[PDB]
Design an enzyme around this catalytic site. Structure first.
Site, PDB file in Angstrom:
ATOM      1  N   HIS A   1       2.408   8.216   5.547  1.00 12.97           N
ATOM      2  CA  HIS A   1       1.454   9.175   6.094  1.00 12.97           C
ATOM      3  C   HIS A   1       2.063   9.955   7.253  1.00 12.97           C
ATOM      4  CE1 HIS A   1      -2.245   8.855   3.886  1.00 12.97           C
ATOM      5  NE2 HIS A   1      -2.278   7.539   3.986  1.00 12.97           N
TER       6      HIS A   1
ATOM      7  N   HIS B   1      -2.564  11.220   0.119  1.00 11.30           N
ATOM      8  CA  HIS B   1      -2.839  10.829  -1.254  1.00 11.30           C
ATOM      9  C   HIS B   1      -4.338  10.954  -1.493  1.00 11.30           C
ATOM     10  CE1 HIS B   1      -4.239   6.960   0.381  1.00 11.30           C
ATOM     11  NE2 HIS B   1      -3.209   7.088   1.197  1.00 11.30           N
TER      12      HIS B   1
ATOM     13  N   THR C   1      -7.071   3.993  -1.275  1.00  5.26           N
ATOM     14  CA  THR C   1      -6.733   2.574  -1.202  1.00  5.26           C
ATOM     15  C   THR C   1      -7.831   1.697  -1.798  1.00  5.26           C
ATOM     16  OG1 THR C   1      -5.295   2.877   0.726  1.00  5.26           O
ATOM     17  CG2 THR C   1      -6.237   0.677   0.394  1.00  5.26           C
TER      18      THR C   1
ATOM     19  N   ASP D   1      -1.508   0.592  -4.861  1.00  6.59           N
ATOM     20  CA  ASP D   1      -2.732   1.314  -5.188  1.00  6.59           C
ATOM     21  C   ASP D   1      -2.484   2.766  -5.572  1.00  6.59           C
ATOM     22  OD1 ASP D   1      -1.867   1.946  -2.677  1.00  6.59           O
ATOM     23  OD2 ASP D   1      -3.740   1.473  -1.644  1.00  6.59           O
ATOM     24  N   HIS D   2      -1.467   3.400  -5.002  1.00  4.33           N
ATOM     25  CA  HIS D   2      -1.261   4.835  -5.163  1.00  4.33           C
ATOM     26  C   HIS D   2       0.102   5.184  -4.582  1.00  4.33           C
ATOM     27  CE1 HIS D   2      -1.888   5.142  -0.901  1.00  4.33           C
ATOM     28  NE2 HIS D   2      -3.076   4.578  -1.020  1.00  4.33           N
TER      29      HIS D   2
ATOM     30  N   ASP E   1       2.441   2.852   3.096  1.00  5.24           N
ATOM     31  CA  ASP E   1       1.418   3.887   3.208  1.00  5.24           C
ATOM     32  C   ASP E   1       1.367   4.451   4.623  1.00  5.24           C
ATOM     33  OD1 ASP E   1      -1.239   5.235   2.173  1.00  5.24           O
ATOM     34  OD2 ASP E   1      -1.792   4.207   4.031  1.00  5.24           O
TER      35      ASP E   1
ATOM     36  N   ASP F   1       0.826  -1.199   0.000  1.00  2.00           N
ATOM     37  CA  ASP F   1       0.000   0.000   0.000  1.00  2.00           C
ATOM     38  C   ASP F   1       0.864   1.253   0.000  1.00  2.00           C
ATOM     39  OD1 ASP F   1      -1.997   2.092   0.836  1.00  2.00           O
ATOM     40  OD2 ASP F   1      -3.269   0.311   1.024  1.00  2.00           O
TER      41      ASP F   1
HETATM   42 ZN   LIG Z   1      -3.568   2.679  -0.182  1.00  2.00          ZN
HETATM   43 ZN   LIG Z   2      -3.054   6.004   2.825  1.00  2.00          ZN
END
Ligand SMILES: [Zn+2]
Ligand SMILES: [Zn+2]
Ligand SMILES: *[C@@H]1O[C@H](CO)[C@@H](O[C@@H]2O[C@H](CO)[C@@H](O)[C@H](O)[C@H]2NC(C)=O)[C@H](O)[C@H]1NC(C)=O
Ligand SMILES: *[C@@H]1O[C@H](CO)[C@@H](O)[C@H](O)[C@H]1NC(C)=O
Ligand SMILES: *[C@@H]1O[C@H](CO)[C@@H](O)[C@H](O)[C@H]1NC(C)=O
Ligand SMILES: *[C@@H]1O[C@H](CO)[C@@H](O)[C@H](O)[C@H]1NC(C)=O
Ligand SMILES: [Zn+2]
Length: 383
Positions: free
Chosen positions: A177, A321, A54, A220-221, A173, A18
């Site tokens: 963050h 994101h 996500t 995912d990103h 992720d 992630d």
């Molecule tokens: Zn994600």
């Molecule tokens: Zn996130």
């Protein structure tokens, strides 16, 4: 001519880390990621779907559909036709109707006579169209990476083995963050993911699956840096009692109260130079984020690196994101190694909606109608 029928290993293990931004590969030494690049295919940047969150994007990978079509439009969304809410904060994700506007690949796979195994991939512990993955784990963030790999290896080497495996991990992720992608502390985080990738490769070799299995590493990103100097305060422009905030930042999904739409919409359009407000009907078509009842009446999109909060004293994260999917910071990685994939090949770009048609081709199953093209990504294959 052969005296034994040769084994057709239409097998796939789909791994998602992630929030793995496309350029994390170069922030630190990533020998295992470059190992796959050397003997596999590599796409420099993936264009994911909007919003770049996500759950919307993981479901695109297993359906090949834009967010407006497969229905998981956000991590937090409200269904006006059914008066139901979907949220991750308390894992309120198990209302099957939220997922049932599309068919994930593991269902189509199992409808074709195969079996699927899931290890924490979003939606694999949710009953969709009355079904589950043949094997799956209840979502529990505490479950270690090694334990998740254990179940995947087990299901691939069992008497009845899966042909599709879904593997998911919450980093980088989470750390991205709290630290922010610019933090030098991300290096140790990325290197750990490379260590974890190597551990998965070892277990696959130990299990005699390495040369029989198409391993796909994606995300995912990405992530972009936020700042205390780039905040947008809704309380400055709006009365909290005049609207309901379905989703917050960086794409605010606003549901005005009865009769307050025009007042809310006017206040938000002239509110901030880095907040662009769209009526649900005016959302840019390139995002493909409009033709669904779960898209709220007003969508206010913050510019890259800008964060929306209701009160300026509220908490915010240094990395975030969800911004416009054209931004390079929101683009994830794509790696793959396997008998079906070229060796030491690289491609400039790929559309994330093109993974679904590729996964179905690799699995020899028939794809549902989708928004990708197998032809865009066929040059990743030996044939
Ligand atoms: Zn994600
Ligand atoms: Zn996130
Ligand atoms: C993405 O793909 C879906 C399915 O192929 C498209 O949605 C279909 O659109 C046709 C005509 O507009 C309808 O007859 C179908 O009922 C739709 N199906 C679903 C599930 O919505 C959708 O238009 C595509 N999106 C884009 C941007 O091309
Ligand atoms: C997560 O998994 C571990 C091991 O199965 C268990 O001890 C723990 O209680 C689980 N957490 C939740 C919230 O279920
Ligand atoms: C924010 O708005 C300013 C105009 O005031 C613009 O110059 C800038 O590019 C915007 N920020 C981003 C990240 O686009
Ligand atoms: C991605 O999709 C767009 C439109 O859907 C198309 O123009 C573009 O060529 C695609 N890019 C790749 C790398 O497939
Ligand atoms: Zn966290």
């Amino acid at each position: 001519h052969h005296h034994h029928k040769l084994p057709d290993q239409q097998k796939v293990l789909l791994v998602s880390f992630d929030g793995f931004r496309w350029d994390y590969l170069y922030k630190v030494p990533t020998p295992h990621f470059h190992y796959i690049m050397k003997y596999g295919v590599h796409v420099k940047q993936v264009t994911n779907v909007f919003i770049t969150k996500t759950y919307p994007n993981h479901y695109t990978l297993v359906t090949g559909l834009f967010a407006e079509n497969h229905g998981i439009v956000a991590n937090d969304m409200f269904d006006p036709i059914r008066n139901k809410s979907f949220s991750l904060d308390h894992m309120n994700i198990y209302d099957s109707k939220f997922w049932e506007e599309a068919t994930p690949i593991w269902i189509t796979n199992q409808r074709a006579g195969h079996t699927s195994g899931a290890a924490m991939w979003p939606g694999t512990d949710v009953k969709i169209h009355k079904r589950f993955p043949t094997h799956y784990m209840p979502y529990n963030e505490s479950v270690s990476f090694e334990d998740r790999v254990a179940k995947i290896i087990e299901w691939f080497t069992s008497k009845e083995p899966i042909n599709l495996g879904l593997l998911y991990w919450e980093d980088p992720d989470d750390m991205g963050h709290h630290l922010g992608p610019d933090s030098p502390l991300m290096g140790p985080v990325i290197s750990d993911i490379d260590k974890k990738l190597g551990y998965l490769i070892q277990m696959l070799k130990k299990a005699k699956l390495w040369n029989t299995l198409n391993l796909i590493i994606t995300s995912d990103h990405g992530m972009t840096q936020c700042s205390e100097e780039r905040l947008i305060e809704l309380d400055q422009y709006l009365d909290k009692d005049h609207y309901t905030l379905i989703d917050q930042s960086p794409v605010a999904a606003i549901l005005p109260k009865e009769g307050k739409f025009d007042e809310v919409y006017e206040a938000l359009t002239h509110a901030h130079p880095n907040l662009t407000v769209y009526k649900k009907e005016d959302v840019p078509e390139r995002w493909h984020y409009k033709y669904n009842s779960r898209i709220q009446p007003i969508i206010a999109v913050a510019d890259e690196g800008w964060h929306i909060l209701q009160n300026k004293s509220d908490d915010f994260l240094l990395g975030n994101h969800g911004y416009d999917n054209a931004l390079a910071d929101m683009h994830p990685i794509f790696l793959a190694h396997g008998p079906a994939f070229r060796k030491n090949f690289s491609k400039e770009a790929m559309n994330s909606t093109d993974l679904y048609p590729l996964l179905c081709h690799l699995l020899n199953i028939t794809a549902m109608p989708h928004n990708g093209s197998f032809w865009n990504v066929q040059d990743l294959l030996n044939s």
